Design a protein around this ligand. Structure first.
Ligand SMILES: [Zn+2]
Ligand SMILES: [Zn+2]
Lengths: 69, 114, 89, 438, 101, 57, 286, 64, 49
RNA sequence: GUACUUC
């Protein structure tokens, strides 16, 4: 659902490189290897932490009972 | 007058039948509706069934069968039918034409890939 | 055995020891003599031509040859004929 | 090297496609359920339930009033009734009509309830006139992604606007605010003789063998009845029927030569006849026909055979009184013996039934290995929605049974004026129950 | 052995009938045959002192099937295609008209 | 439990205060016993740990 | 009935089955198997059958295993010679896969059976009514998509992968041999590198997880629910995880596994979790 | 015709009863009376043979 | 072994292979009480049984 | 009462 900040095993500040990672995939054409490492992620657990996220919050936000449609 | 159909029989044809004691016998085959009953002029007769006809579609095979059914012979018009009997009248080898479409086979060049 | 009120069982079993002078080539003789053989197991085929003309029946019962049925199932005419005349009929 | 999707996944998370949704395999996963309940509306003849009430039979009853030996013979006029049309169209509600939503349906803690319209073809005196009438029979519960719910041809983006799932699956009922699913049912092969060797036939069969072969016909509306054939050590062979809670043993002859005219060598000719060498055919066939002539020597043609069938089975299906043995006999017959051939199927019905019993002789002669009631050789799968339609067809006739019982109950207490009045049709139509939805 | 065809027609007059196996063919009474003209459908009936003929021609599926017949001698060795409408029949009797009220 | 069939119940919640640490810095959050493979034979977890190691390395 | 049979190959999954009493009772359908839910109105199956050379039903007058009884669904048309059944057994295959035949539906059941070994009554079966099951399969001659049912694979042999295919003793090939697995089994990576007692033991686990039921929470009124928040998609996965949109429903997560007996608090059936992981919300759900 | 131990009739299309269970040299049909029989049917003979299926033994296994 | 039997016209049709098969599986050449088959097995631990 | 699940 939400971006898991402060990875349980590593502990790095990881809840900030999400939108930066998305921008690297949007208008930079860099692949997963050199871009995810360029963010500043060097340990194994922090590599899989950001890479595995599913960001299901977009599906959890398409239903608002306080707004017409 | 059962049933209430269209029209009773009025036209007949005479069959030249001698009844020889080598012997003039009947010839019946089986064929579908989409056939060449009018545009075909030749048909090869052979031994135990192994043959093939050659027309536009070109997939046929004349089958034979050894092993009943009575056939009426209209000797004249007023009765339009008789009973075929020599001593009724049996048969020997009924014909049934089939359509053996040649199945394209054995291409073991693209399915067997390293 | 424990609870079903043990009675005549599907496959009854009994073990019989033997002396030291008897041999295996003599034990099989008692095996064939004691082993009960069905009367129907000495027939090749059962062909019968039922006639009518007053019902009439004829029964022709093919058997094996002497070396087959008499050497395999140790029976002969003095027992096979007595059972086919006193029990089968 | 199957790299996962992040840009495509982010795009489909931002907005679903306005066109046909992606990954259609998930939509095809419920093709059995969606296609099953949707089959009763599409196709010819209005679907399953429409052709079912088409081939449902017409039932009549008399009254206690005279007209004016033959005068006293006629005991009363004829009133006719039969279910002509049945149709579910669309769920709606009111205080014009307004449209309901499934999300609001389970939020209301109720079931998704539409409405069912019934069209009655009321007749009198063999069609002298018809009192047309249409009455609703409550609401019919419908699942999602069906022909009744509005989620059939709705875009997935509009599904998000309707408080639904972006990839909604559907195909499951909802009742009393909780969801619910109909379990798929397992049956055996349809329209195929099944060989079975089971000692259970010896329990209910007094001195009968363990052989057996069965046939499960199927009507066009998928309702069926099981017709099996046993084996008799004496030499004969008998069917068994299946009614409410009753079994009917019957010899093969009195129902084989009773459909139409077949009493000739066509029976023995239908038997294997390439060679007359083996006599296992002769002893069984002669003993079978001898077992038919020894019982009733005055039964030779299908007419009198059908008279005896209608006579013994006159008061079993409640077909009375004007339906004589020649009507009730053919009626119960075509409904009891391999109904899958349908009406006018007597042209080759003897050929299919003879092939069934001849496979029994081939099963007892010892050249056909028995099948298995649990193997996938004869594994059929009722998708649940078809069973739901069969329950509808079955539990609709109870209204017909209740209105004919209401008429024959009102005729007991008298004071039943002629039924040619519309207000009399109404006063007799309100006494019968009409809530099928519950 | 290729062979040619000589005789063709447009209206049939011959018929093959299937009653059962082993018909002694008494041949003592002429039975009538009613025709039609869909296409390729015929019927026939007859009457006797204990027998009545009743035969139809595959009313279910006959319009998509046709049989022919011919003849050949050792000198001729050729056949003549003649339309033979096949017919299945069932010998009927009269033991009707009995019913219980 | 995983997708390979092996199951397990949480015995006692224990922090990184005494668990074996790696030379890199990562702390193993969950620990499974190697004494189940002789009988349960869940080597799928072995081949998928190497595959998962490369799939995340 | 509890035990399975090899005839269930590719029809019902031999892997998805619970433990205990429901063993062998309930086992859902295959992966890509189809179910014909309507009768295709053909009215031409006999129109091409007896035209191919099949004798009619009213003028055959035979029986026994020496003749192949061709059986349409419900209706019969007659029996022919066994050699005719052999040629028709492959002729109907070619005309079925060929698209120029308007009178032959793709979802047509066709079966052939030899008469030897005292098998059941031979013939030529034809079906396709309701309650009928299908599954995809590839036909080698003029390679094209095809489907079979519960009677085809009984007699005629199939090839699972284009490496065991050999000459003139095969008729059909399978595209991906994992289509026999279920949704849980095919999603399980390297299901071939485990045991069947582990596949039945895990079938209940995957079918008892605590994943996301669907994004309808604020508009659902069912009795009880469960929801996680650390839903992560597995790194290793099959192409069906994406083909089924399973990414839309995250059910678990990924953690580092350390195979080691250092804990001592576990013996071949227990587990231990990091307190720091629980502080981050290791499998935190409500 | 005549097949096995039973003779059929064509004038009414059915089969007749046993000439021994009823009076001899004169038998009738079941639905209509006809001039019958000619009292020259046949000498009735028929053959039955066991298919050798339910006869298991050790020598039946060695003959294979 | 061939034997011929006669019978009157009271019964018309009977089963031959069945009524003979029953008696074929009911006649016993020699009746040894409560035993039908014996086997000479292999001696276990030198104890011939 | 009917169905479902835990070793
Ligand atoms: Zn980390
Ligand atoms: Zn007669």
């Amino acid at each position: 659902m939400i971006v898991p900040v402060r990875c349980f095993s590593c502990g790095k500040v990881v809840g900030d490189k999400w939108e930066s990672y998305l921008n690297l995939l949007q208008e930079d054409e860099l692949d997963e290897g050199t871009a995810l490492s360029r963010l500043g992620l060097k340990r194994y657990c922090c590599r899989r932490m950001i890479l595995t996220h599913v960001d299901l919050i977009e599906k959890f936000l398409r239903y608002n009972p306080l707004e017409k449609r | 007058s059962i049933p209430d159909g269209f029209k009773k029989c009025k036209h007949l044809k005479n069959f030249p039948l001698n009844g020889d004691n080598k012997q003039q016998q009947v010839w019946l085959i089986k064929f579908p509706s989409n056939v060449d009953i009018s545009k075909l002029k030749s048909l090869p007769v052979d031994f135990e069934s192994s043959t093939t006809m050659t027309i536009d579609k070109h997939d046929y095979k004349i089958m034979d069968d050894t092993d009943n059914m009575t056939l009426l012979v209209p000797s004249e018009s007023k009765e339009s039918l008789k009973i075929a009997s020599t001593a009724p009248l049996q048969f020997d080898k009924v014909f049934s034409v089939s359509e053996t479409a040649k199945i394209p086979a054995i291409d073991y060049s693209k399915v067997r890939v390293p | 055995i424990v609870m079903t009120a043990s009675a005549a069982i599907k496959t009854p079993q009994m073990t019989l020891p033997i002396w030291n002078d008897v041999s295996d080539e003599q034990a099989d003789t008692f095996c064939k003599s004691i082993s009960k053989v069905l009367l129907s197991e000495v027939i090749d085929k059962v062909i019968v031509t039922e006639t009518t003309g007053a019902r009439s029946y004829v029964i022709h019962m093919r058997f094996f040859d002497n070396n087959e049925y008499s050497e395999e199932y140790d029976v002969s005419k003095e027992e096979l004929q007595n059972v086919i005349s006193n029990q089968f009929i | 090297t199957a790299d996962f999707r992040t840009l495509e996944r982010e795009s489909r998370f931002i907005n679903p496609p306005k066109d046909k949704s992606a990954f259609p395999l998930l939509q095809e996963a419920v093709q059995p359920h969606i296609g099953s309940f949707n089959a009763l509306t599409e196709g010819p003849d209005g679907g399953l339930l429409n052709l079912g009430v088409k081939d449902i039979g017409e039932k009549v009853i008399f009254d206690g009033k005279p007209l004016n030996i033959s005068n006293s013979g006629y005991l009363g006029n004829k009133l006719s009734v039969s279910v002509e049309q049945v149709s579910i169209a669309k769920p709606m509600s009111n205080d014009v009509e307004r449209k309901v939503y499934p999300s609001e349906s389970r939020q209301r803690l109720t079931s998704y309830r539409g409405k069912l319209l019934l069209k009655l073809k009321w007749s009198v005196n063999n069609g002298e006139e018809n009192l047309f009438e249409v009455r609703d029979c409550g609401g019919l519960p419908v699942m999602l992604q069906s022909n009744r719910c509005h989620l059939n041809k709705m875009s997935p983006y509009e599904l998000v606007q309707h408080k639904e799932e972006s990839d909604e699956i559907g195909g499951y009922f909802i009742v009393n605010g909780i969801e619910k699913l109909i379990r798929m049912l397992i049956v055996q092969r349809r329209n195929h003789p099944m060989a079975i060797i089971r000692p259970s036939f010896a329990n209910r069969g007094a001195s009968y063998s363990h052989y057996g072969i069965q046939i499960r016909s199927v009507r066009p509306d998928q309702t069926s009845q099981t017709n099996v054939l046993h084996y008799l050590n004496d030499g004969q062979v008998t069917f068994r029927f299946s009614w409410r809670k009753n079994e009917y043993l019957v010899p093969v002859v009195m129902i084989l030569k009773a459909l139409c005219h077949t009493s000739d060598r066509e029976i023995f000719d239908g038997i294997i006849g390439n060679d007359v060498k083996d006599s296992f055919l002769t002893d069984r066939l002669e003993l079978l026909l001898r077992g038919f002539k020894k019982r009733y020597p005055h039964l030779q043609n299908r007419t009198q055979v059908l008279q005896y069938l209608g006579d013994k089975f006159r008061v079993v299906f409640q077909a009375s009184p004007d339906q004589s043995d020649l009507e009730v006999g053919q009626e119960v017959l075509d409904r009891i013996v391999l109904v899958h051939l349908g009406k006018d199927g007597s042209q080759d019905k003897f050929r299919m039934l003879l092939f069934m019993i001849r496979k029994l002789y081939s099963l007892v002669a010892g050249e056909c290995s028995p099948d298995n009631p649990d193997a996938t050789q004869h594994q059929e799968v009722l998708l649940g929605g078809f069973l739901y339609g069969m329950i509808l067809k079955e539990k609709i006739d109870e209204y017909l049974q209740n209105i004919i019982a209401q008429v024959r109950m009102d005729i007991n207490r008298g004071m039943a004026i002629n039924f040619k009045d519309k207000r009399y049709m109404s006063r007799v139509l309100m006494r019968v129950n009409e809530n099928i939805g519950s | 052995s290729e062979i040619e065809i000589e005789s063709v027609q447009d209206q049939p007059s011959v018929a093959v009938g299937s009653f059962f196996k082993g018909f002694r063919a008494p041949s003592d009474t002429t039975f009538d045959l009613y025709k039609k003209k869909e296409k390729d459908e015929f019927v026939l009936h007859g009457e006797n002192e204990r027998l009545e003929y009743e035969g139809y021609t595959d009313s279910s599926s006959q319009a998509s099937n046709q049989y022919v017949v011919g003849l050949f001698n050792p000198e001729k060795k050729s056949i003549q295609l003649y339309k033979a409408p096949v017919l299945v029949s069932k010998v009927v009797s009269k033991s009707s008209k009995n019913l219980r009220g | 439990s995983s997708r390979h069939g092996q199951k397990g119940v949480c015995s006692r919640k224990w922090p990184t205060i005494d668990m074996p640490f790696s030379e890199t810095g990562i702390q193993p959050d969950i620990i499974i016993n190697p004494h189940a493979f002789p009988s349960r034979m869940t080597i799928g977890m072995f081949v998928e740990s190497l595959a998962g190691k490369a799939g995340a390395l | 009935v509890r035990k399975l049979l090899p005839e269930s190959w590719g029809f019902l999954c031999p892997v998805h089955t619970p433990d205990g009493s429901p063993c062998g009772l309930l086992n859902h359908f295959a992966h890509k198997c189809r179910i014909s839910t309507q009768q295709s109105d053909v009215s031409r199956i006999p129109s091409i059958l007896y035209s191919l050379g099949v004798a009619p039903a009213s003028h055959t007058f035979a029986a026994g295993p020496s003749l192949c009884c061709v059986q349409i669904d419900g209706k019969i048309i007659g029996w022919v010679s066994h050699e005719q059944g052999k040629i028709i057994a492959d002729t109907l295959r070619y005309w079925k896969v060929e698209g120029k035949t308007p009178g032959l539906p793709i979802d047509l059941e066709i079966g052939y059976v030899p008469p030897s070994t005292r098998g059941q009554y031979p013939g030529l079966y034809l079906f396709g009514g309701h309650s009928r099951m299908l599954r995809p399969v590839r036909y080698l001659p003029l390679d094209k998509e095809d489907i079979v049912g519960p009677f085809e694979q009984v007699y005629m042999n199939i090839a699972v992968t284009p490496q065991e295919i050999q000459n003139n003793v095969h008729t059909h090939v399978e595209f991906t041999p994992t289509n026999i697995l279920s949704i849980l089994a095919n999603l399980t990576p390297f299901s071939d590198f485990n045991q069947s007692p582990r596949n039945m033991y895990q079938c209940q686990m995957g079918k008892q997880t605590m994943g996301t039921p669907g994004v309808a929470l604020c508009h659902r009124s069912d009795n009880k629910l469960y929801r996680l928040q650390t839903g992560q998609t597995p790194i290793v996965k099959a192409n069906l995880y994406d083909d089924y949109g399973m990414d839309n429903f995250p059910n678990g997560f990924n953690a580092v596994v350390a195979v080691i007996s250092y804990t001592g608090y576990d013996m071949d059936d227990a587990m231990i979790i990091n307190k720091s992981a629980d502080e981050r919300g290791f499998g935190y759900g409500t | 015709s005549v097949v096995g131990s039973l003779i059929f009739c064509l004038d009414c299309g059915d089969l007749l009863e046993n000439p021994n269970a009823v009076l001899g040299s004169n038998v009738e049909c079941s639905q209509c009376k006809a001039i019958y029989p000619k009292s020259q049917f046949s000498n009735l003979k028929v053959v039955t043979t066991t298919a050798d299926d339910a006869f298991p033994s050790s020598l039946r296994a060695k003959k294979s | 072994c061939e034997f011929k039997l006669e019978l009157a016209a009271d019964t018309e049709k009977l089963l031959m292979v069945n009524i003979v098969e029953e008696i074929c599986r009911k006649s016993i050449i020699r009746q040894i009480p409560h035993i039908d088959r014996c086997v000479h097995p292999e001696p276990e631990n030198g104890k011939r049984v």
